[PDB]
Amino acid sequence: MKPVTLYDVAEYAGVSYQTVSRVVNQASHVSAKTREKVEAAMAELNYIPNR
DNA sequence: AATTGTGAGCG
DNA sequence: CGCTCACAATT
Ligand code: NA
After folding, report:
1. Which sequence spans correspond to the domains of chain A?
2. Which nucleotides of chain C have an atom under 7 angstroms from any protein CB?
3. Which nucleotide lies nearest residue A22, CA to C1'?
4. Interval between CA A28 and ligand 1 midpoint (Å)
5. Which intervals of the chain form a coiled coil?
């Protein structure tokens, strides 16, 4: 499968890789609108854990 | 005083 | 390259 990364979903949402990692694991500091971006980025794109 | 970004340490 | 963990320059 296409190795869709944390970055791809982050840029797609308009957020940082670390902000989007903190939507997956190590979760601190996530906002109303920013969260809803990450969700639409994860579900429209076929993100792969660890690739 | 809140977050992103950067650092670095694991794989 | 890809990611969790942890910490801090900037705002
Ligand atoms: Na992950």
Report:
1. 1-51
2. 1-6
3. C4
4. 15
5. none
CATH number of A1-51: 1.10.260.40
- Residue labelled with tokens 């990450």: A38
| Dihedral Cα A12, A15, A34, A22, nearest 10 deg | 110
Tell how far the Cα of A41 is from the centroid of ligand 1, in angstroms: 14
For tokens 């994860």, the residue is: A42
Q: Which nucleotide is nearest to A16 (CA to C1')?
A: B4
Contact assessment for residue A51 and residue A5, using Cβ atoms and an 8 Å cutoff: yes
Quick one: which H or E segment has residue A10? helix A6-13
- Side-chain half-sphere exposure of A32, counting CA atoms within 13 A: 0
Distance from Cα A5 to the centre of ligand 1, integer Å: 9
